[PDB]
Structure formats: C-alpha cells, structure tokens
Homo-oligomer: A and B are copies of this chain.
C-alpha cells in the first residue's frame, strides 16, 4: 500500500500527538492504576518473585541455578534507554515489551526474562503493571542475592503501544560510526538527544569504541553516555561494578547461529526471538552478546569480588568463542564457577568497559575507594540503582506503596511539604483583583505563568510551575524567560504575596508558585473581559516554593526551552524545521493537535511572544482573548511570501493592494498550510466559534497549569 509518508516523506507528522487514545487502551475509562496498586499485596508478589529466581524452566535454563543476573540486566535495560536531553526512554512506561525495544540487539534474550514473569503477571493482573514488575523483579533479584536496596516505588501505569522516539537515523542495527547516518561528528560528539553510541545499544559497545578494545578510550564513551542518562562518575562506577558483581555474559558459539529478533520471528515463536542453532540453543550453549565473561567467584551472591579481581590481576586480551574481544587474568587459578557443570572452573574475565573502571584516571580513584571501602560501594550502588530505576517517575507524589524511601534526594527536584491552610475561592478572587490592580498587563501575566508551567515534560514528568523554580537559578536567566521583564513581574507578585500573607489569620498563606499561576489566570480572565466576555479560569492551590539549595542547577539545564513555538521562540538555527519542533514540544506538554492549535492561537493574541515580536500577532486587539489569529490567518485576501532577509519569516500583504498587514514565522503559517492543522484552524476561525474558542483556550491553559499536580491525582 503506498502511503502518505511515501509520497510526502517530509510533511509534518501529527500522529505522535494522538498516540495513547482511549481506543487502544483495554482498560475502562475510569481505571485508575494507583488505586489498583495500592491494594496489591506487594509482600506476596515479592515472595513469588523470590521463589521464581531459583525455579529453572527447561526452555531457558537458569545459569548457576539462579535467574537473578538475567533479571538485573532486564531491569537495568528497562531503565537504561533514558536520555536527559528530552526525558524519553526509561522504565516508566514498560516500553521494553513493545517495538522497537523488545527487539534491540542489546535486549537479546530479555524476551525470555519477560516470559518467565508471565505467571506472576497473570496471577496479580491489573494490580501490578508490567512497568512496575520489571523494576520490582530486579530489586527482588538483588535482595535474594544478599544486597540491600534503597527502596522501591510503584505507580508506573502500563502503556499499550510504542512511544514515538527518535533513536537515531541509522538503518542498520549496530552500525559503526562514520556511516551516512552517523550519530557522531567532530571530535566524537554524539548528536542530541541521543545517549547511546550505536543504534540498538543501551549505552556503549562492550568490546570498546567501534569495537576497538582500548579501555581508556572506552571510558570516554562510558562517561559521555552515562552523563546523557543523568549519571556522574561516582554513580557510573557504582552501577557498572554493582551490576557486574552478578551473573555472566553469553557467547558460547558464533553469532551467526542466532536467528531473527522477536519482531521478525515467525508467528509460531509466540513473541520470542533470537532462536539459536548452536547446540541446545540455551543454557550452557546460550548466545546473547557473543562475549563469554563471568566476573566473580560467587555470581549469585553480592560480594566485593568485582573490584578484588579488577585490581588483583593483570589482564590480557583474548577472544570469546564467538570471536569478540574480552580480557582474561592468565596468571590466575581457575576460581570462577561454571554456570552448569560443577566439575568446571574458569579463570577471571572482564570486558574492555570493565577495565575502563581501572585504567581511566578519574574512574580509578573512585574504583579504588570502592575497592578499599566496599560498604561505600554498596551504599553508592543502592542509591544509584534507585535513581536509575525511578529517574523518570516524576514528583515523589506519584510514588506508591510501602517501600518508598523517606530520604528526599536532590535529583527528585523536591517540593517542600505544605503545612498550612490553603487559600479558598474568595481569597483567589481577592488576589486576582490585587494582581490586576497592580498594573501588571495581560501580556506580562500570561507570559510569566506560561514560562513557569511550560517546562513540564510528560516523558519523565519533570518540570512545571510547582516549586516556583522560575525565580531561581537557572530558570530566571533563561533567554526564553526574558530575565529582566521576569524579574520586574516577580518583584510585583512577591509584594502582593507579602501583603496578603501578612494580613492573614491562623496560618493561611499563599505560595509564590501558586500566585504566579493565579496571576496568569487573572491575565487570561482580563483578556476575555477585554473581548467582552466574563469567564472564570479554574485554579487549584497547593503548590509550594522550593529553595535554591533544593535545586540542582546543572540538572535543570536540560529543561531550558531552546525552541518554544508557543512563544514564537527559537534560540538559534537548527537543522529541524521549527514546525517539527512545535509538535515535539506539544508532545512533551501532553497536548493533542486541537489543544496545540487553540493554545497557540490564543497565546499569540495575548502577547506571549518572546521579545514582544509581532510575528503571528494577527489581531488589532492585542491582549484580548479572541479567535483573531485564526480568522486573519485563513483570510484569502492576504497573500504570503518569504522575506529576502530571512526565508523563515513571511510577509502577509493585501492581495489587491500590496499593503503589508502581518509578519509570521513557519510556526504561525503551518496552521494555514498543513492539511490537518488547517482543518483545525478552520473550526476555531468560523463565525460560530467565539464561545468554543474561549472555552477550549481556558481548558487547555488550565491543563498546562496543572501538568505537574500529581498531589491532586
């Protein structure tokens, strides 16, 4: 079937905005996973998981009699797709069980691990999501083997279709760098938003960079990819050495014996893949990565033997049975157990990337400290494991169940508890009135609240207006946020806040986070009044103010909007057209195409644009809430041409006279060009639409204001 994507491969793709519809969801409209989980007997699940670790199935027999290593690998890969640059990937949606992740080469034989979990999934049904179960299983594996974890939170609801993620442009699995779709340029600079060195890997190549087995150069790739997954040097060392305390790799024979990945396998495979023709195809004969390394003398028990071996031996380069580069301690005795034959023992082996921990100078210092102080190693690993597996779960308010750690961690962007009565409706009306009486304009109000609320991204549920981090470094100095205008608004709102709070009885006070939002609501209400319409914008108090000391400035950098079509803002020049970056931002904001369309056209006429640019301001009543953007954008009396100065700026002129009416960017004019977006613009630009426009604008404005309010979930 030839499709639209075939005829018009560069048209904008809206389908990413209508994924996750109620149509694809098997659960009822009212199903609430947190309610279900909260009644799960979690202790019972963990007991069944503990029994499972040592109950070998003949179709994928357990190494050493214990599946714990396999399950730790499964849970680390579930979490290990995460990229800080956009928040996408991670364990939070259980996406390892969908394409393409289920079939990535680095996820080979994790289809077996997931299948081992079906009996338990089936037993507990909807009360434990696959997403939660993958992580819980890795915790239970660690615990069964003697390792004390830092805790566990439930609350990852299942999803029902693949997410749309840019994983790279390569068309070949595992393509080495330098090809026609290379993700590298310059001096080994990996393109944003990617966080892996090759298509279909989690982070790095275990043999070394593009297969070159140099521990020192491998360490460069480790550091860069782990940083792109939000982990620093100490977390990276602790995670790699911790994970490789357990289990083993699989490379018993040549990789050519391994068949089709799950998405390519025959229907009789029933969702499994990588069927191998090497001997029995499993167990002693397993082939997964092609490497054949067992790190420690007790692969089913927590120990400090990884570092004992790494530092205690001198290493030499060798080849696995599948021909991959790996390292062996030739002076060692045969002290490592065989996974299936109690009469065999093996010498210590390591991957190139394990030796990175010793031969990179900065990693060596850390590894040495963990070697000498294994209690420090255990604590670091427990903390990093928790971070790894929860990094995309959002605010602590989403965390469910009896094992949530009480310690509040800086990475969580924590929000202080609220310990005082909240403003009520009358108080909100009084504050709206004071804000409007202060002289702050509709534009200032709308822009400030937008700036605060629109850092949210649903990919990892970071950002949003809770915390009032807009007043802190680095958000207060972001170019998009108009730092000097922003400072003047915040000073005025802070004086209003101080006056109101000082006049109260009995502990009632308003947060600046809440007042910034409410003030935005007042601006929207005044804009509707300017247009002749009385509306009330809904407002939910309860946000709290975070301190600068509770705010990791470097972690906050990835939230900076460098492209924000809702404010007609582009920080620099990008390869990707601005309209594509608008849809990407809409997706992060969890907006449908209709919601994107209404929100943009209202923001334009409210004066939300950065720098007060006239681009897309297609109204002669700026700061009134009307459908003017749509009516003027769709007026065929106006003809549009790119300017000589800038091909991405357009002049709209009267078709009969030539007089200049408007200017616009690609983001403005896409609404008049794309056949689906123009059909939406039409609805809002019709003569019957004034009420609908205002209603829908208020609804989406309020949705954006509440994106991080999991305390009301």
Query: Would you call A325 an interface residue if the criterion is a C-beta within 8 Å of the partner chain's C-beta atoms?
Result: no
Query: Would you call A621 an interface residue if the criterion is a C-beta within 8 Å of the partner chain's C-beta atoms?
Result: no
The residue among A268, A631, A683 with the most chain B CB atoms within 10 A of its own CB is: A268
Query: Would you call A656 an interface residue if the criterion is a C-beta within 8 Å of the partner chain's C-beta atoms?
Result: yes
Residues A686 and B271 in contact in the complex (CB < 8 Å), given A4-B162, A24-B593, A679-B160: no
Query: Would you call A65 an interface residue if the criterion is a C-beta within 8 Å of the partner chain's C-beta atoms?
Result: no
Interface membership of chain A positions 682-709, coded 1 if the CB is closer than 8 angstroms to chain B and 0 otherwise: 1111111100000010000000000000
Cα A58 to Cα B636 in complex, Å, equals 11
Query: Would you call A640 an interface residue if the criterion is a C-beta within 8 Å of the partner chain's C-beta atoms?
Result: yes
Query: Would you call A32 an interface residue if the criterion is a C-beta within 8 Å of the partner chain's C-beta atoms?
Result: no
Query: Would you call A100 an interface residue if the criterion is a C-beta within 8 Å of the partner chain's C-beta atoms?
Result: yes
**Contacts of A118 on B, CB cut-off 8 Å?**
634, 636, 682
Cα A484 to Cα B631 in complex, Å, equals 63
Q: Is the CB of B267 within 8 A of A102?
A: no
Q: Is the CB of B8 within 8 A of A99?
A: yes
Q: Is the CB of B263 within 8 A of A125?
A: no
The listed residue (B5, B57, B199, B670) touching A267 by CB distance below 8 A is B670
Q: Is the CB of A673 within 8 A of B24?
A: no
The listed residue (B99, B125, B597, B641) touching A26 by CB distance below 8 A is B597
**Contacts of A11 on B, CB cut-off 8 Å?**
99, 263
Interface membership of chain A positions 263-291, coded 1 if the CB is closer than 8 angstroms to chain B and 0 otherwise: 11111111100000000000000000000
Query: Would you call A168 an interface residue if the criterion is a C-beta within 8 Å of the partner chain's C-beta atoms?
Result: yes
Stretch at the interface among A13-21, A46-54, A78-86, A501-509: A13-21
Copies of this protein, total: 2
Query: Would you call A2 an interface residue if the criterion is a C-beta within 8 Å of the partner chain's C-beta atoms?
Result: yes
**Contacts of A267 on B, CB cut-off 8 Å?**
650, 666, 669-670, 673
Q: Is the CB of B24 within 8 A of A592?
A: yes
Q: Shortest CB–CB separation between residue A70 and chain B, in angstroms?
A: 16
Residues A122 and B685 in contact in the complex (CB < 8 Å), given A4-B162, A267-B673, A640-B268: yes
| A 153-203 contacts with B by CB, 8 A | 158, 160-162, 164, 166-171, 199
Q: Is the CB of A594 within 8 A of B686?
A: no
Cα A636 to Cα B55 in complex, Å, equals 15
Q: Is the CB of A125 within 8 A of B669?
A: no
Q: Is the CB of A669 within 8 A of B99?
A: no
Residues A687 and B125 in contact in the complex (CB < 8 Å), given A25-B594, A263-B8: yes
Query: Would you call A97 an interface residue if the criterion is a C-beta within 8 Å of the partner chain's C-beta atoms?
Result: yes
Q: Is the CB of B171 within 8 A of A122?
A: no
Cα A9 to Cα B471 in complex, Å, equals 49
Subset of 25 A-B contacts with CB under 8 Å: A1-B166, A3-B164, A4-B263, A7-B99, A8-B103, A11-B263, A15-B15, A18-B24, A25-B594, A26-B594, A26-B696, A98-B676, A99-B675, A102-B675, A121-B682, A122-B686, A123-B686, A124-B688, A125-B689, A126-B689, A160-B680, A266-B642, A267-B670, A268-B673, A271-B678
Cα A296 to Cα B21 in complex, Å, equals 53
Query: Would you call A92 an interface residue if the criterion is a C-beta within 8 Å of the partner chain's C-beta atoms?
Result: no
The listed residue (B2, B18, B642) touching A169 by CB distance below 8 A is B2
**Contacts of A431 on B, CB cut-off 8 Å?**
none
Q: Is the CB of B270 within 8 A of A673?
A: yes
**Contacts of A97 on B, CB cut-off 8 Å?**
675, 679
Cα A123 to Cα B686 in complex, Å, equals 6
The 10 closest A-B pairs by CB, nearest first: A125-B688, A21-B21, A125-B686, A26-B594, A18-B23, A270-B672, A8-B263, A268-B640, A23-B592, A267-B673
Q: Is the CB of B673 within 8 A of A271?
A: yes
Cα A17 to Cα B100 in complex, Å, equals 20
Cα A355 to Cα B184 in complex, Å, equals 63
Q: Shortest CB–CB separation between residue A48 and chain B, in angstroms?
A: 12
9 further contact pairs, Cβ within 8 A, besides A14-B161, A26-B594, A126-B688: A118-B634, A121-B682, A122-B631, A124-B686, A160-B676, A160-B680, A266-B642, A268-B641, A270-B640
Cα A101 to Cα B166 in complex, Å, equals 29
Query: Would you call A343 an interface residue if the criterion is a C-beta within 8 Å of the partner chain's C-beta atoms?
Result: no
The residue among A118, A670, A675, A686 with the most chain B CB atoms within 10 A of its own CB is: A675
**Contacts of A124 on B, CB cut-off 8 Å?**
686-688
Query: Would you call A646 an interface residue if the criterion is a C-beta within 8 Å of the partner chain's C-beta atoms?
Result: no
Cα A435 to Cα B127 in complex, Å, equals 40
Residues A122 and B682 in contact in the complex (CB < 8 Å), given A2-B171, A170-B2, A268-B642: yes
Q: Is the CB of A655 within 8 A of B59?
A: yes
Q: Shortest CB–CB separation between residue A577 and chain B, in angstroms?
A: 9
| A 15-43 contacts with B by CB, 8 A | 15, 17-18, 21-27
**Contacts of A5 on B, CB cut-off 8 Å?**
5
Nearest B residue to A668 by beta-carbon distance?
B267
Query: Would you call A395 an interface residue if the criterion is a C-beta within 8 Å of the partner chain's C-beta atoms?
Result: no
Cα A650 to Cα B269 in complex, Å, equals 11
Q: Shortest CB–CB separation between residue A224 and chain B, in angstroms?
A: 22
Query: Would you call A115 an interface residue if the criterion is a C-beta within 8 Å of the partner chain's C-beta atoms?
Result: yes
Q: Shortest CB–CB separation between residue A543 and chain B, in angstroms?
A: 28
Query: Would you call A209 an interface residue if the criterion is a C-beta within 8 Å of the partner chain's C-beta atoms?
Result: no
Q: Is the CB of A687 within 8 A of B170?
A: no
The listed residue (B18, B25, B593, B634) touching A122 by CB distance below 8 A is B634
Q: Shortest CB–CB separation between residue A266 and chain B, in angstroms?
A: 8
Query: Would you call A554 an interface residue if the criterion is a C-beta within 8 Å of the partner chain's C-beta atoms?
Result: no
Q: Shortest CB–CB separation between residue A1 and chain B, in angstroms?
A: 5
**Contacts of A636 on B, CB cut-off 8 Å?**
57, 59, 115, 118
Nearest B residue to A684 by beta-carbon distance?
B26
Q: Shortest CB–CB separation between residue A254 and chain B, in angstroms?
A: 24
Interface membership of chain A positions 631-656, coded 1 if the CB is closer than 8 angstroms to chain B and 0 otherwise: 10010100011100000001000011
Query: Would you call A333 an interface residue if the criterion is a C-beta within 8 Å of the partner chain's C-beta atoms?
Result: no
Query: Would you call A659 an interface residue if the criterion is a C-beta within 8 Å of the partner chain's C-beta atoms?
Result: no
**Contacts of A642 on B, CB cut-off 8 Å?**
266, 268
Cα A678 to Cα B98 in complex, Å, equals 10
Query: Would you call A711 an interface residue if the criterion is a C-beta within 8 Å of the partner chain's C-beta atoms?
Result: no
Q: Is the CB of B24 within 8 A of A98?
A: no
Interface membership of chain A positions 114-142, coded 1 if the CB is closer than 8 angstroms to chain B and 0 otherwise: 01001001111111000000000000000
**Contacts of A640 on B, CB cut-off 8 Å?**
268, 270
Cα A102 to Cα B679 in complex, Å, equals 13
**Contacts of A18 on B, CB cut-off 8 Å?**
18, 21, 23-24
Residues A199 and B2 in contact in the complex (CB < 8 Å), given A21-B23, A669-B267: yes
Q: Shortest CB–CB separation between residue A692 and chain B, in angstroms?
A: 8
Query: Would you call A262 an interface residue if the criterion is a C-beta within 8 Å of the partner chain's C-beta atoms?
Result: yes
**Contacts of A1 on B, CB cut-off 8 Å?**
164, 166-167, 169
